[PDB]
Amino acid sequence: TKNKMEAKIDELINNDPVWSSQNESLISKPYNHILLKPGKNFRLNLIVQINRVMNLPKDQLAIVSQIVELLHNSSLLIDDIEDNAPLRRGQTTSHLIFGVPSTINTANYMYFRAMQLVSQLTTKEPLYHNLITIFNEELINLHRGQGLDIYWRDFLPEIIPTQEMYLNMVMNKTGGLFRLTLRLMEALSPSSHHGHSLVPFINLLGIIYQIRDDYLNLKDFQMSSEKGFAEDITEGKLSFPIVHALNFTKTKGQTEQHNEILRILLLRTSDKDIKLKLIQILEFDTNSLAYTKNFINQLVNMIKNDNENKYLPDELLYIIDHLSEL
Amino acid sequence: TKNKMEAKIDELINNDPVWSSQNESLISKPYNHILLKPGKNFRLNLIVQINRVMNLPKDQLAIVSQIVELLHNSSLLIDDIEDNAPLRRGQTTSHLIFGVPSTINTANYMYFRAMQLVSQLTTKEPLYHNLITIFNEELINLHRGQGLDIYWRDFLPEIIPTQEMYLNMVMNKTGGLFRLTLRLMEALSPSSHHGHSLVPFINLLGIIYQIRDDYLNLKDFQMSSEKGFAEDITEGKLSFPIVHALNFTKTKGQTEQHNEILRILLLRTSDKDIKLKLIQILEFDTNSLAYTKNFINQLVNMIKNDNENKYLPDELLYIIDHLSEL
Numbered sequence: 243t244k245n246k247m248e249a250k251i252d253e254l255i256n257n258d259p260v261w262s263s264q265n266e267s268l269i270s271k272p273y274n275h276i277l278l279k280p281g282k283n284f285r286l287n288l289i290v291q292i293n294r295v296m297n298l299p300k301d302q303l304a305i306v307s308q309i310v311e312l313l314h315n316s317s318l319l320i321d322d323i324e325d326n327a328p329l330r331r332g333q334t335t336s337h338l339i340f341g342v343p344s345t346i347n348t349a350n351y352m353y354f355r356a357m358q359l360v361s362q363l364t365t366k367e368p369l370y371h372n373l374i375t376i377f378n379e380e381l382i383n384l385h386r387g388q389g390l391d392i393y394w395r396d397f398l399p400e401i402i403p404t405q406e407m408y409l410n411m412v413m414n415k416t417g418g419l420f421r422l423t424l425r426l427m428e429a430l431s432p433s434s435h436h437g438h439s440l441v442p443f444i445n446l447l448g449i450i451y452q453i454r455d456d457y458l459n460l461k462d463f464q465m466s467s468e469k470g471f472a473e474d475i476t477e478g479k480l481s482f483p484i485v486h487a488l489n490f491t492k493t494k495g496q497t498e499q500h501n502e503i504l505r506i507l508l509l510r511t512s513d514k515d516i517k518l519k520l521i522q523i524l525e526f527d528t529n530s531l532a533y534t535k536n537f538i539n540q541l542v543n544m545i546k547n548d549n550e551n552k553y554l555p556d557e558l559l560y561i562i563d564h565l566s567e568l
Numbered sequence: 569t570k571n572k573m574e575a576k577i578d579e580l581i582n583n584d585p586v587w588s589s590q591n592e593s594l595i596s597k598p599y600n601h602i603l604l605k606p607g608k609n610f611r612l613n614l615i616v617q618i619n620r621v622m623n624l625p626k627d628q629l630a631i632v633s634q635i636v637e638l639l640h641n642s643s644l645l646i647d648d649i650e651d652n653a654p655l656r657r658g659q660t661t662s663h664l665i666f667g668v669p670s671t672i673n674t675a676n677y678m679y680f681r682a683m684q685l686v687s688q689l690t691t692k693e694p695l696y697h698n699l700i701t702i703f704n705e706e707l708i709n710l711h712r713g714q715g716l717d718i719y720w721r722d723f724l725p726e727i728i729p730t731q732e733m734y735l736n737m738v739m740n741k742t743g744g745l746f747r748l749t750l751r752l753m754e755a756l757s758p759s760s761h762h763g764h765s766l767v768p769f770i771n772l773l774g775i776i777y778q779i780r781d782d783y784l785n786l787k788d789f790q791m792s793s794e795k796g797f798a799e800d801i802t803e804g805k806l807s808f809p810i811v812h813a814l815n816f817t818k819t820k821g822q823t824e825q826h827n828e829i830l831r832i833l834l835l836r837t838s839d840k841d842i843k844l845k846l847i848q849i850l851e852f853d854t855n856s857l858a859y860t861k862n863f864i865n866q867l868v869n870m871i872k873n874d875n876e877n878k879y880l881p882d883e884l885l886y887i888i889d890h891l892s893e894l
């Protein structure tokens with residue numbers, strides 16, 4: 243009917259868009275799948291410990307936590323598509339089960355659900371503005387560092403990053419979410435003057451976290467063809483040890499080794515022997531693994547020897563030792 | 569050195585993350601590539617026309633425009649990855665030149681750059697909160713609609729949507745950015761009482777826009793194997809004409825035709841002959857193209873005959889006829 247048609251259309255356009263709980267569940271599949279991954283208690287533990295200094299009431303702390311989890315999980319769903327990763331914590335990656343399209347859309351949807359939860363942290367307009375700014379700033383930083391990490395890898399050998407370039411990329415990429423969490427808590431703290439800001443400390447933790455992630459991905463494989471897959475090699479990633487090896491070989495004039503490192507990265511290979519060959523070049527030829535192990539210990543020592551509490555404000559050590567499960 | 573190392577690390581963590589204009593350019597490549605696509609003046613046209621009623625000052629209108637262009641472009645970069653599209657406005661899609669990883673990251677980065685421009689629309693804390701809420705809500709709506717469109721396509725034949733389901737998906741998917749633009753403008757209007765909200769009107773524009781897009785994707789191919797490629801068929805899309813046909817064949821018990829349409833969609837084919845074959849079922853068996861043409865005219869009529877200005881508040885007609893270049 244021309245009349246019934248028009249009446250139904252009129253009703254449609256005069257109401258909010260219709261969305262059912264059934265709809266909500268269908269599009270949530272990729273997210274529900276990655277929730278089966280653990281490590282959630284470790285992240286919560288770091289938030290709970292920082293809260294000994296910030297004192298956010300429990301209800302508010304739970305919301306900060308929900309925001310953090312959504313952003314962290316969304317980042318991993320996108321990152322696995324970006325890295326072409328087959329597994330995440332021993333399980334099949336969501337994009338391989340539900341497809342790349344649904345996974346990208348669900349991860350992006352969850353970023354906006356996280357943004358929505360921010361307005362539940364306060365009713366004070368000045369504070370709210372500040373919270374959304376922190377959220378906006380650090381997601382911008384995360385995307386900038388992720389953008390460089392990806393560009394270096396996909397356009398190699400166009401740019402061979404230096405250690406400093408790598409470190410600035412990580413301050414953006416990994417620091418983004420650490421700082422996002424910490425800044426929200428500091429903005430919300432009802433506590434008078436809980437001492438100097440912990441941003442430097444959280445930046446340091448983000449850097450130790452990333453470099454250790456890079457280091458263990460190779461070391462675990464070197465120690466066992468089944469402890470890890472050294473998937474970072476398959477991905478062609480300009481990891482901390484690889485950056486050291488590429489610059490070391492350049493510097494010492496090891497032309498053949500420089501080029502062979504690049505060649506293997508460019509193969510995107512899953513061959514275990516070829517991955518082990520590159521790892522042993524880093525072990526014996528460039529000593530990049532030892533150099534990295536020592537760099538990490540030095541970073542950790544800047545905290546463990548922080549007597550004048552210039553970074554620190556106990557549980558510290560445990561968190562640092564389990565930094566890999568964040 | 570252990571001393572200098574620590575010193576360089578302390579400096580790094582006590583500063584904001586380092587990001588250069590050169591870094592900014594690398595990450596912007598996938599985005600600058602789509603900027604070579606036209607239609608921007610048409611979208612600006614619609615904003616300019618609507619501004620006759622809203623009267624936002626030129627500077628503020630320019631920022632709304634920038635926000636609109638970033639969201640529109642980002643959503644197109646992501647959509648082409650989600651639909652595996654080889655071309656966008658006669659040109660090679662960005663993910664095919666810069667890779668899916670850089671394109672996803674850059675598109676997401678730009679959503680956040682747009683979010684940042686929102687805080688430059690006003691300094692009034694109450695209005696600002698409302699602007700962010702508009703931004704947040706409509707982007708959530710765009711992702712819900714997109715998630716469902718993708719779900720139906722990727723899970724076909726699990727769910728065959730009805731016309732109403734399709735129309736609710738469109739209110740979310742397409743209406744999201746039309747409403748986002750209009751709501752921002754209505755929230756910012758200094759103008760006293762610029763008449764009833766134009767949201768119902770913009771909703772209708774979005775529906776007409778989407779159904780015409782689905783319609784032309786097939787009609788252009790039916791009229792020329794080089795005017796268009798009917799990529800929607802290759803994508804397996806549950807487009808308006810396809811939804812009508814699947815339900816028309818179910819309804820009349822034409823079991824073989826119902827199944828043949830599904831088989832073609834499920835092929836994900838680029839074979840012109842097979843695509844023409846689907847088009848002829850829609851033209852001769854279900855008459856879905858005429859039905860759709862007629863449905864569109866009826867929608868348009870609702871505006872063309874809106875004498876009591878229930879939806880309208882001249883350039884209306886031109887806008888309606890060039891709705892496809894938005």
Ligand SMILES: [Mg+2]
Nearest residue numbers: 321322325327
């Ligand atoms: Mg990764």
Ligand SMILES: [Mg+2]
Nearest residue numbers: 647648651653
């Ligand atoms: Mg599309």
